[PDB]
Symmetry: C2
């Protein structure tokens, strides 16, 4: 599996001027090894990112709606994104599931519409503190993945990347270890193998989407079932290239 | 009060090419009388709209988040919008309150943050079918407006426009009359007068945000408390200019 790093800017930076400075920095970074790099940014900066970002990397939306267009004030759709030549979207980020109240049925419909319309997706999942504390992580995560599975059209698993977020370690007073990340990525891979088969499970990139920094990326990358990262705050920083380059420690 | 027409493209068109064709059409329209025209478009088309739209009209976002930036994957913020020179946002559209589950507390926080950060807002309200059928429209609408009121900083009412949407007439099998529109705009004006005073009530533009087409805009515009329109589907059509030009029938 080709190591995969997505840089999620989230709702940052504040200005188009800062977004352009950041793009210029990414454009000069020397990448080592072999890695697929995708950069996700706010809708408003997506045109400038598509125009100016280095051509060997790909741009991604941070969300899309379920419909092609229509009476959905405030929403951006797949055709709009695609009309810019943009090929990726993130779906189901914890921040959207939590703050914006996106449920599994909403997200399943997004994944289905996105893939049926030629998009590639980074589909996020992960359990909260009570399920982690109860030792029920795999069950929670399996239910999410089981909702996702029927959305994927035949022949589209090559266009699917799954990111595991240890939500239990986000603003809870608890931290995730390197072993935690390996364990949950493996859980996901096994759920896929059981449900859709080993060939698909062996090809789908599963990413660690907890806290990833220059000080932990090489050890994380080395876990056998960790195929890359959905990077939060470090994507805004020159340390993002350390993370991209951690691929040389993954085998 | 200067007549005010906002063109809400909603989640349309599907492509940047269509958005550019539409902008070129708007750019050639001959405006009559005196009217303040604002055009709201999907986040992804906002840069091209700001760049290319006629300078005597203003661009608007269709939504914004409550925060300046941060861990809010998928969301666009006021500073981002402002970094393009964009001055307006719509807030609280029925489609967002309904489909995207935006509640009054969320919307109040958006209005407060937006205005405190120099934005001008088009704040939407309106009652559903059961409150219309029960004859309880004014009470429902008053409660919405009463939630909005504390969000408006001192000296910012000049940066506030209110749009009334007859949600009871949207996909319900019921249609709104011209008299309905006048009556509810007046209801809103009176709530403002009672709560914040006649000087403010006499200056705030209150818009009809139900179905507005070339075949009803002149009669609607002529209602004394209707100060303009938040236009849906006709904003995508050459008929939008008829609606903009209906200002000559308002006094
Ligand atoms: Na267990
Ligand atoms: Na395929
Ligand atoms: Na690995
Ligand atoms: Na009554
Ligand atoms: Na003012
Ligand atoms: Na009028």
């Amino acid at each position: 599996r080709t190591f995969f790093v997505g840089g999620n800017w989230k709702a940052n930076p504040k200005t188009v001027e800062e977004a352009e400075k950041l793009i210029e920095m990414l454009n000069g970074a020397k990448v080592e090894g072999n890695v697929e790099v995708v950069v996700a940014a706010p809708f408003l900066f997506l045109p400038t990112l598509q125009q100016k970002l280095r051509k060997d990397w790909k741009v991604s939306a941070e969300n899309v709606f379920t419909k092609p267009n229509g009476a959905f004030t405030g929403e951006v759709t797949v055709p709009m994104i695609k009309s810019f030549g943009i090929e990726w979207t993130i779906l189901g980020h914890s921040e959207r599931r939590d703050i914006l109240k996106e449920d599994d049925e909403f997200l399943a419909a997004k994944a289905k519409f996105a893939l049926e319309n030629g998009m590639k997706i980074i589909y996020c999942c992960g359990e909260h503190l009570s399920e982690r504390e109860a030792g029920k992580a795999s069950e929670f995560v399996s239910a999410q993945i089981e909702k996702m599975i029927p959305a994927i059209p035949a022949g589209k698993w090559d266009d699917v990347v799954i990111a595991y977020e240890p939500i239990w370690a986000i603003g809870t007073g608890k931290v995730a270890s390197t072993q935690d990340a390996q364990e949950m990525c493996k859980v996901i891979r096994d759920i896929l193998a059981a449900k859709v088969g080993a060939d698909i499970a062996n090809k789908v990139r599963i990413l660690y989407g907890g806290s990833v920094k220059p000080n932990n990326c090489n050890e994380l990358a080395a876990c056998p079932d960790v195929d890359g990262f959905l990077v939060g705050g470090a994507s805004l920083e020159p340390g993002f290239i350390n993370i991209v380059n951690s691929n040389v420690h993954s085998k």
